[PDB]
Ligand binder design. Structure first.
Ligand code: FE2
Ligand code: FE2
Lengths: 171, 170
């Protein structure tokens, strides 16, 4: 119980569900969840993590880094705890980019995401968060919020010519 | 035993050329290399593009196979320049893996019953009917010859994941 929480891998039914909202903030259980997620994400050099990825079906995501080894060309993204999120695209403009996932180890695929979003949610103390994001920041937020509705990035790919093993695509 | 290319390599996305000349030392050597590679990886089938050779050559078949432990014996076959004709449009879903997609399984709809036509490495005709897993592996291997891996054929990506998660008794 004191060991780092394991990341569930694609195929597990818990990655395919609708997460429930957090109803009570600033609780010992929620602080422990956030702590567990950061420890799990940092240990795996993740860019983000969603609670369903450690088997917790709650609307909690974390993301952010300065320099990240799995995505070495990505700019810094502010470290964030985002609970009960809503995403609103500012326009319908999209961009294709390469995504991975700690629940899909070893692979990358090209996924289109909105270029410009606003997002809203709360931190673990219940304080509102309201932000605008573009580019990779916007991409990570969309990827993580997808986990909360049971979506993994291969479900967003239409052209699987742009999908394969990281070591082959990025040697 | 030659290296099996992994998904992401552009050579797996090519449309393969037909074999022009049969019973040549070059073709026999290719077939031998494919069998060694396939058996060393416990493969159910293998296509020439998976070892980097852009030719319409596939092999398949076994008595028992550990990666598909429920599958019945499939005739050990060399199939060159193949064509597939469905007997009907009846489709069925089944779990597929691939040596070029190591570690994963996905549910893929295939024709339940097919006729298939081709040649062995000596140029003798092959004209068969197949159902079930035999028909599935023939469709899977012939897909490699037109640059297709099974993720291109999956309709429901909730039925795609790592083998040991989907099948923990493996
Ligand atoms: Fe993810
Ligand atoms: Fe294959």
């Amino acid at each position: 119980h004191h060991m780092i929480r394991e990341i569930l891998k694609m195929g597990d039914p818990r990655l395919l569900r609708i997460a429930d909202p957090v109803d009570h903030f600033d609780t010992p259980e929620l602080h422990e969840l956030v702590k567990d997620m950061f420890e799990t994400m940092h240990d795996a050099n993740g860019a983000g993590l969603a609670a369903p990825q450690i088997g917790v079906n709650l609307q909690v995501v974390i993301f952010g880094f300065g320099h990240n080894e799995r995505y070495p060309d990505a700019p810094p993204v502010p470290e964030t705890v985002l609970i009960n999120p809503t995403i609103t695209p500012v326009s319908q403009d999209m961009e294709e980019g390469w995504e991975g996932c700690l629940s899909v180890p070893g692979l990358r695929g090209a996924v289109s995401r909105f270029s410009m979003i606003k997002y809203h949610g709360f931190d673990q103390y219940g304080k509102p968060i309201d932000r605008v994001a573009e580019g990779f920041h916007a991409r990570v937020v969309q990827h993580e919020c997808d986990h909360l509705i049971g979506k993994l990035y291969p479900m967003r790919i239409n052209d699987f010519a742009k999908f394969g093993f990281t070591e082959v695509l990025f040697p």
